[PDB]
């Protein structure tokens, strides 16, 4: 969505979606879809 461009909730949010993850690991896990679809 859009909370602050791409940096809303949680210290580890998706800079592509504006998601929110409490773990940097889970961030990368979601961002796996941002590699090559
Ligand atoms: Zn994302």
Q: 20 CA distance to ligand 1 centroid (A)?
A: 9
Assess contact for 9 and 1: CB atoms under 8 A.
no
Residue 25 backbone zone (phi > 0: left; psi -120 to 50: alpha; other: beta): alpha
CA of 13 to the centre of ligand 1 (A): 8
Tell me the β-bridge partners of 3. Answer: none
Chain centroid to CA 30 = 7
Cβ atoms of 18 and 6 within 8 Å: the answer is yes
Experimental method reported for this structure: NMR
How far, in Å, is the centroid of ligand 1 from the Cα of 23?
14
- Taking the CB of residue 14, how many other CB atoms lie within 10 A of it? 20
Contact 10, 25 (CB under 8 A): no
Cα(27)–Cα(19) distance, rounded to whole angstroms?
Answer: 9
What span, in angstroms and rounded, lies between the C-alpha atoms of 35 and 11? 21
The three-state DSSP-derived secondary structure of the chain is CCCCCCCCCCCECCCCCCCCECCHHHHHHHHHHHCCC
């Amino acid at each position: 969505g859009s909370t602050r461009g791409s940096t809303g909730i949680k210290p580890f949010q998706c800079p592509d979606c504006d998601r929110s993850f409490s773990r940097s690991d889970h961030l990368a896990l979601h961002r796996k879809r941002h590699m090559l679809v």
